[PDB]
Design a protein around this ligand. Structure first.
Ligand SMILES: c1ccc(-c2cc3c(Nc4ccncc4)ncnn3c2)cc1
Ligand code: NA
Lengths: 296, 286
């Protein structure tokens, strides 16, 4: 059930922590022993009403192989007066993130045809979200996961209502600015930060720079300074001239400043850099190897 | 200065009990000194290559500048090796939680004006100590102002004193970059603004602009007039203290020393009684 607020008892249970940060657990399905990732946050009773409202605002969308499947939201109550707990459950991916991938690679840079393959998977996941009228809102290397089969999946802890960004005294945080499109940043020219499905495509382009260089543009900058520069700077660029013409054009394709003039997911899926991948099979293999030697 | 290599494993020295809160970077635990049972707050930060120097700095500032009754005292630092090592930053445990906590657990989410005068003064004394050492806290807010079980007031978190942007609601106008302020130039008086907002938080239960999206608050703060208390009940002194913390242009905002001489801060006759009222309120919430 994706429209309810049940107790996780008998359906899901926690086994061990992964990282402190939201707090993420390695969990399991009780009735089938299937592994799942579970985000656990403390919520007040005032916030629980807020998430009831947001469950109403949810949009439905089927499973999709480029999205880590969102299994639903649960609440594990505590004694009267104390803060309860919100669980957000999602498919488990054991090969880590794309950021881990680029860090666990010599020179902190991926091969261009790896970037092409990964970028296309992100786009296909996003096409599925956008065609069902949902913005992802947080595309970056950290939020793109590899499975133990070189499958690339977007993190979904309920992106439709953004439940993991809306409550738990972390919702008052501005967060990391490096993957933000110009239009989501309030500034002198844009007093109301509009979010659009095309915001994801800017972040997608930033994620491509991240794969290519290990870090998003302006990573050397204090985050408040970057937030100021992003709506003001011309579109960011790859530092090195080593890259193919197709790659530069794709980056330029994503990073159109004015979102009204930025292409849709469908258009970018047809971009020659994304569309024409002759070494795809070998790349899927190459990634499998990299995941395996890392595990030893 | 400290070197991360020399740091010992915490085993048999400190043990973690339970997560008690968060930091700018790192989870905060109610920890325990194994040999004596004495409590300590422990900040558990994962030592990555990117955040490796940010951690080093938080140790050094906490170590050198926490020798003042209004700064939560540095105990020591430890590393618990794993290949993603954990660093344990150990300091004085403030049992009563935060100011934000206090107001939200008080009836009608507001504190008596003389609780606010005492608490704000303690904040200002800790701040004066930092400023005279040429340190700017940079993240003063109710969540970083703590209370011990004895109603003592202590400043924590030198995290942003030296990649994520935190909450904006307590930021001074001058730390927010914009066209006529492209480099976000600011001084020690940034903290005094934040102290004003913290006082408003004690008075109303939330900072100004709390109903706004944080990104929208970031845009508004440099454009909006100084925030004002909603109610007309407060004294003339309190209004004037808030006005003084919240001078829009930091160039003519009073210094920490000047605000300590503000009658609202300076003249506290019921101080003795306030500490008792506060102590009681902490006990009735436990
Ligand atoms: C209930 C909730 C939180 C506390 C608490 C948090 C801290 C703390 N937190 C931080 C320390 C350093 N940096 C950020 C936070 N430091 C020192 N004591 N303490 C007590 C107590 C009761
Ligand atoms: Na001290």
């Amino acid at each position: 059930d994706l429209s309810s607020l049940r107790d996780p008892a008998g359906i899901f249970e926690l086994v061990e922590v992964v990282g402190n940060g939201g707090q993420v657990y390695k969990g399991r399905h009780v009735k089938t022993g299937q592994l799942a990732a579970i985000k656990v946050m403390d919520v007040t009773e005032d916030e629980e009403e807020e998430i009831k409202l947001e469950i109403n605002m949810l949009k439905k969308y089927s499973h999709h192989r480029n999205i880590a499947t969102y299994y639903g939201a649960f609440i594990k109550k505590s004694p009267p007066g104390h803060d309860d707990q919100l669980w957000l459950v999602m498919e488990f991916c054991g090969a880590g993130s794309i950021t881990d991938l680029v860090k666990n690679t010599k020179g902190n840079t991926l091969k261009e045809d790896w970037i092409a393959y990964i970028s296309r998977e992100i786009l296909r996941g996003l096409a599925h979200l956008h065609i069902h009228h949902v913005i992802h809102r947080d595309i970056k290397g950290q939020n793109v996961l590899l499975t133990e089969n070189a499958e690339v999946k977007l993190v979904d802890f309920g992106v439709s209502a953004q439940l993991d960004r809306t409550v738990g005294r972390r919702n008052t945080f501005i967060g990391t600015p490096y993957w933000m499109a110009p239009e989501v940043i309030a500034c002198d020219e844009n007093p109301d930060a509009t979010y659009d499905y095309r915001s994801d495509l800017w972040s997608c382009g930033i994620t491509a720079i991240e794969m290519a260089e290990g870090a998003p543009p302006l990573c050397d900058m204090h985050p408040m300074r970057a937030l100021f520069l992003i709506p003001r700077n011309p579109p960011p660029r790859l530092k090195s001239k080593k890259w193919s013409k197709k790659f530069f054009s794709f980056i330029e394709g994503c990073l159109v400043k004015n979102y009204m003039q930025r292409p849709s997911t469908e258009q970018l899926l047809k971009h020659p850099f994304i569309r024409d991948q002759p070494n795809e099979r070998q790349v899927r293999i190459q990634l499998k190897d990299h995941i395996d030697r890392t595990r030893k």
